[PDB]
Amino acid sequence: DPFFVVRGEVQKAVNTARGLYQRWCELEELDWTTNELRNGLRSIEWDLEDLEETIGIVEANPGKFKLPAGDLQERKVFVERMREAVQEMKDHMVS
Numbered sequence: 404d405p406f407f408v409v410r411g412e413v414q415k416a417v418n419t420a421r422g423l424y425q426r427w428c429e430l431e432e433l434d435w436t437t438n439e440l441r442n443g444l445r446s447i448e449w450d451l452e453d454l455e456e457t458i459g460i461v462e463a464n465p466g467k468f469k470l471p472a473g474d475l476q477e478r479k480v481f482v483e484r485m486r487e488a489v490q491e492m493k494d495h496m497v498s
Contacts, residue, residue: 409454410481416447417488424492441496444489451489454482 423440430436458478461468 406454406457406478409450413447413450413454413481413485416443416450417485420444420447420492421488424495437496440492444493444496447485447489451482451485454478458482 420440420443423436423443427433427436427440458475461470462475
């Protein structure tokens, strides 16, 4: 399943979580939103872990994958951006 396909799915999930987060900040509805967001963030993180593992595999075996170096770097930046986006929301859910 190509990285670019997964990338689009992860971005959509982060955008959806941000929508929930904006609702949560505005605000039983609060309890439901808290749960939905916590679950949603955990789900995104599982997906990010998988992307990170694939980056590691591809970098370690360039003969097999032949992924251009620029493209590999853009994957790492994408994962870092998404991790940061998730962490911003997670910070506010603590406790």
